[PDB]
Design a protein around this ligand. Structure first.
Ligand SMILES: CCCCCCCCCCCC(=O)OC[C@H](COP(=O)(O)OCC[N+](C)(C)C)OC(=O)CCCCCCCCCCC
Ligand SMILES: CCCCCCCCCCCC(=O)OC[C@H](COP(=O)(O)OCC[N+](C)(C)C)OC(=O)CCCCCCCCCCC
Ligand SMILES: CCCCCCCCCCCC(=O)OC[C@H](COP(=O)(O)OCC[N+](C)(C)C)OC(=O)CCCCCCCCCCC
Ligand SMILES: CCCCCCCCCCCC(=O)OC[C@H](COP(=O)(O)OCC[N+](C)(C)C)OC(=O)CCCCCCCCCCC
Ligand SMILES: CCCCCCCCCCCC(=O)OC[C@H](COP(=O)(O)OCC[N+](C)(C)C)OC(=O)CCCCCCCCCCC
Ligand SMILES: [Cl-]
Ligand SMILES: [Cl-]
Ligand SMILES: [Cl-]
Ligand SMILES: [Cl-]
Ligand SMILES: [Cl-]
Ligand SMILES: [Cl-]
Ligand SMILES: [Cl-]
Ligand code: NA
Ligand code: NA
Ligand code: NA
Ligand code: NA
Ligand code: NA
Ligand code: NA
Lengths: 311, 311, 311, 311, 311
């Protein structure tokens, strides 16, 4: 149980394939996803050549311990994959066809800049390290790359599952490593964000603007402070479903901006009361009437600017 | 330890059965459930046949390693099932009777459209991959499909546990695959939703409508904004027990609609105050009196429309 | 190894005992508890009999693999128990004495009808399946059923740990099965519920009733709506520590009833204000004075009725 | 691989030691803690004795399978410990020195009566069950009991790690059992409780007492009800970090008492308003002025009484 | 399989290296982080030396069981590492090159004094215990210490991964132990704390100060008490993402200080109302006008003092 010997001086090519059976638990905060799939492997080992006439059988079936199997690992996994060998078939020339079903929790960074209208490219990196006897290189058998039609990732649309056919061959700790990039392209189902977060957040904001049709300071204070507290609750709710990013997200920008609108509404409500107490309500009336137009107009234009900067 | 050889050119039929011992942890957000059950398998292995009058023994008990056993897997599981072989019995003609007790976490999508008045069909998909020597096909032994009377899934009523007797035979990565669909039909116990969520949510809404019998703007603002905040708390509580769906749920629709009622109540309370300040209370009185009838009437008709669209 | 042969045609009796070492994690929502205990087993295997004189030993120790051991399982467990064999002792007549220490997560339904003044009977169901060679039946050795004095279940009082001595013998998948019921009787420590939930909930309710000694509508609206919101917080807190039941719990009934008291207090506060504005305060005064007696009296009588229906 | 035979009729003494490497995850609610430590064992096995002059070797190293090792278990663990044998060394007289590194989740009850100014004694109970051949007894080698200087338990001060040198020898299921008590003494770091919970809780209470310098009923109702709601939030926050106890904790007592102060403040605010409406403000003034002194004085004396009863 | 014998009396030097593949799950509350890395080991075993000419190979590949391998452990791990041996290679002079890929959960204390503008030094302590045959000492092969360019720790910047080349040699239970300190220097990405916590917290505080431009006690009480409650929500949110420390954190200090500002604002609002009721508004006006300057000035200076003490 050592690697197959080279006929000339070539590296050993291990053909690979990943067929997705299940996709689940895309954790946005952890930037992980769980996968259940078939991993297929194929390589020539002439030491396993046989005559179907003598052995009786046209294809030989082996146990993983009985023969040499390339040590294939995943780069971006939390722990080593849970695998169960399904089959090891050896054909007369010594071509090995290896099939395993595995499950793994994959680390794959996510770009939240356009959240909740974002798309992602999840990666599964396959790797093999070369041995001293000989260099091992990975290849993609496109016939053995795919996904079950029923594969569903709750809250996401699965677009494609493809592999970058050219491996990344590089040196690591004085030995060659051959890395393959399997890419799962997904797009977020933003639907539910509209009736659950976006519209309720707009309703409470518009409710605070009713203070521009009221001269009652005590009612105005209650309108703007109460809706601000509801906005804080939405800010907290949203930030619990997201990791801390060194950049602004689209939702983060809108949520932050809405604070400025609450802050300026408090200034307006204060200025209005102050002028009324100072017996200059004609002035207060001019500021309040302007605010009725300015607040929705500046809100609309600021949102057009933000949508433009982000999309 | 190779598959039993075919007498002619027929596929090997593996008769299956699942007997549920325990059902627990139906997680709505994760769309998973845990199961503890018996898995029974039966097939003919002529290489294992024996004489009943010569041997004296009617049945022979083997260890799993001693004989060939079909590699049966579950499609929609998180990780491979935890299984412990209970018994292996061989009849004189070579009919093998295999029994294992297993536990598994099953991925099965849920339809939340009618939540909390929803019914579901949970699936357990049994699968076998054919070997080079011969094709393996699955069958259902209805005599060995069932569930323990004590099987309880907290918050659900278990209706039936049946199997679709015709397997889905298809090619996958150049080998035949035979898939069986075991269906667990359940209906949600909606009882607790009435005193815990539905009635409290209706009470706070009706409390906001007392503002239509009050001329006090400051009290009205307090009534409508305070009850709105309580409604936000219920919206958040409900959405934490549910996943994000690319469709509207019945509860989601009602919760969303109730925001419109709070928004229009704020408009009414604002309009009423504005007219009183403008010394036109006769008008304000006509709008407030109309609102006393309009709000409960439109609420009832909108709910009839929603119940009709969803049921 | 095969089961011990019958001298005549009797079933093989496996004597059992469970000695509790640790009880922990009684999860009310999951309706599970974790257990760490000794499982003792005893049966006669004539094939292992020996003469004490020519052996020089009064007892013989064996490794589990060396002899036949009955396949004993738990019915109501999440996963198969984690077990470590402690000792296997054989007496001259071939009486085997087996002892293992195990840990398991047990599914046992709970009756929340009288919560938090409830008592429960937790079950541990022991089971054995019969073989073709012979019928295996379970028995209880009462001398080997017990619990360590230090066994504590946080938030509960342990009353007794007994076994129903007569097994439930029945056919399951065309083999007889012998089931024993081990019962752990516990009663909930309701102490903490009094200063943490019951009294705070009564205080906020009594605070809302101070509105019956106030003519200030604005203050009344603030008193009743603010305490209602605090009651919603307690309702949410309580329902998070409990599963959803298809029946009313004692606490659920009280919590639900207190909403009616808040709803009727809002009606009273509204009616009082309406009459004052309509220049009929003498009337409003009669309703408010009646409410001062009616609300505590109806609250006391409704609680006596509820306590009667539930206890 | 049977136990060492007795020279006379003495029990086999197994000398033990536990050296703590890591302490983590002290879970107050679960009353558990995780430990990573060295477990050292020593006993005489004359069958393993050798001559040091003729062997030329001072010590012999054995693999665990090669020799007899006592079955040592922990009483108060969730599951059996995860252990890795480090070394087995035999001296010429046959004295065996066993060393393993283990990790375990330990169940150890906590006394919350003085929380957050509490100290605890965590226990690790070592146990051995006597075999039929001979009685096994445990002993403490104080030279092999200790802890790493870097051992830190977040939020706690580690005082000492000692063992009660005299084992508890007792009969359990017709065999002797030898139990040792390893004690880890810890004291809670109460620092953070002062700026995060104690002072904020006192500030909101003192804010409610500003109502004794106000004649505005509407403002008073807002002051006392709003701060009460903040107190409910702190009550909930505190009770989430603690298990339910069948006794009063120091914090629980203070939190409960503060409700009485809010309840009596509401009565005072109600009585004051009622008298003002009844045109007897001179009286109301006497009650309000008395309350300014009574509330802080009774609060101070009640806290002195509570601190005395608990410390 | 015993350790390599010493030529003279020298300790065996085991050269080590850690190459980080993945860094994830830095848990601030638990003070843990998960790591996936290569562990490389190298030592001279003369008994394994060979002639390249005679053998016909320049390298010899062994299985871990075939040769002696040093028992290397991590000090600060929850459980023993999950390791898979990748390669073992022997050079003609007996120089062994061992490579394993492992995953571990590491305990490493964090200094929260400057949070969220903090930097940390995570430690991975490698350790080896000497055997009776010989003393084993650890060394760092700097050529085999590193990290993959794609190594990302969500919410942190990775600065460096270095090893302290001189081991900490010490006696533990009368055997030499050799400890190496691998240091991962990280700095927190404080960006998101600015729009999510810092600015919202400043906005609500500045909103409370609008009470210094209002004579309305009832509106003032609403402004200061409502924003205080929002501050309590932020205090709770922040303290949930942090462990309890026996020292003040920078954020903790600011959060605590902001309570004093709310408390003094309530005193000012009370004093102002009291004087107005006592018919001395000229005085109240002088205190309120001073407060408009004093509150922002003292807030700015207190923050400069705090930033100075902490940075
Ligand atoms: C307050 C702000 C309201 C939010 C407005 C929507 C944000 C937006 O502008 O959303 C835009 C995204 C589309 O994005 P896309 O095609 O994936 O982006 C890739 C863009 N490239 C390839 C051009 C670079 O969603 C939609 O289909 C719009 C439906 C949202 C309705 C919201 C109703 C309220
Ligand atoms: C505010 C609105 C309150 C909610 C009203 C019930 C919603 C509904 O209409 O519920 C309807 C479901 C019944 O559903 P079904 O027969 O399973 O559906 C299959 C229907 N087919 C066969 C026609 C397609 O619930 C019930 O049995 C009614 C009990 C609800 C009582 C709620 C009290 C308040
Ligand atoms: C607002 C409502 C106030 C709380 C009502 C108490 C509920 C109750 O009455 O609880 C009753 C239970 C006892 O019941 P038991 O032994 O389970 O019943 C078995 C009944 N048989 C045998 C008749 C069928 O509690 C107690 O020991 C009393 C403690 C109550 C303290 C209340 C403090 C305020
Ligand atoms: C509102 C209530 C305020 C709480 C006041 C502290 C409680 C207390 O009284 O704390 C007292 C405990 C001391 O107790 P000890 O040494 O553990 O007990 C052993 C006692 N024997 C040996 C006598 C039995 O803590 C301290 O070191 C005091 C520091 C607390 C500062 C609190 C600032 C507010
Ligand atoms: C309300 C208070 C507002 C927050 C004040 C900023 C915190 C601070 O003063 O932060 C200080 C740290 C600097 O830390 P450093 O260089 O890593 O430390 C090593 C320091 N030595 C080498 C001198 C010992 O952060 C910053 O770069 C400040 C950017 C944050 C601006 C937030 C504005 C809103
Ligand atoms: Cl892997
Ligand atoms: Cl499976
Ligand atoms: Cl079991
Ligand atoms: Cl143990
Ligand atoms: Cl380790
Ligand atoms: Cl030393
Ligand atoms: Cl040494
Ligand atoms: Na192999
Ligand atoms: Na087999
Ligand atoms: Na108010
Ligand atoms: Na056996
Ligand atoms: Na042993
Ligand atoms: Na070795």
């Amino acid at each position: 149980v050592s690697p197959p010997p080279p006929i000339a001086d070539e590296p050993l090519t291990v053909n690979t394939g990943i067929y997705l059976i299940e996709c689940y638990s895309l954790d946005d905060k952890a930037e992980t996803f769980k996968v259940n799939a078939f991993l297929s492997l194929s390589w020539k080992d002439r030491r396993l050549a046989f005559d179907p006439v003598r052995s009786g059988v046209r294809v030989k079936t082996y146990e993983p311990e009985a023969i040499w199997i390339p040590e294939i690992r995943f780069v971006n996994v939390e722990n080593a994959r849970d695998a169960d060998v399904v089959d090891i078939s050896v054909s007369p020339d010594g071509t090995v066809q290896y099939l395993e079903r595995f499950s793994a929790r994959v680390l794959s960074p996510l770009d939240f800049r356009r959240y909740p209208f974002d798309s992602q490219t999840l990666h599964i990196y396959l790797i093999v390290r070369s041995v001293d006897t000989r260099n091992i290189v990975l290849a993609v058998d496109l016939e053995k790359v795919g996904k079950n039609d029923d594969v569903f990732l709750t809250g996401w649309d699965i677009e494609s599952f493809t592999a970058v056919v050219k491996p990344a061959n590089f040196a690591l700790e004085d030995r060659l490593e051959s890395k393959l990039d399997y890419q799962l392209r997904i797009s977020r189902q933003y639907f539910s964000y509209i009736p659950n977060i976006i519209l309720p957040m707009l309703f409470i904001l518009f409710i605070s603007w009713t203070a521009f049709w009221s001269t009652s300071y005590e009612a105005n204070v209650t309108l703007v402070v109460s809706t601000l507290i509801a906005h804080i609750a939405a800010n907290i709710l949203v930030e619990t479903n997201l990791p801390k990013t060194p950049y602004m997200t689209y939702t983060g920008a809108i949520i932050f901006m809405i604070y400025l609108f609450y802050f300026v509404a408090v200034i307006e409500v204060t200025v209005q009361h102050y002028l009324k107490v100072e017996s200059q309500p004609a002035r207060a009336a001019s500021i309040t009437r302007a605010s009725r137009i300015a607040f929705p107009v500046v809100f609309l234009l600021a949102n057009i600017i933000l949508a433009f900067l982000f999309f």
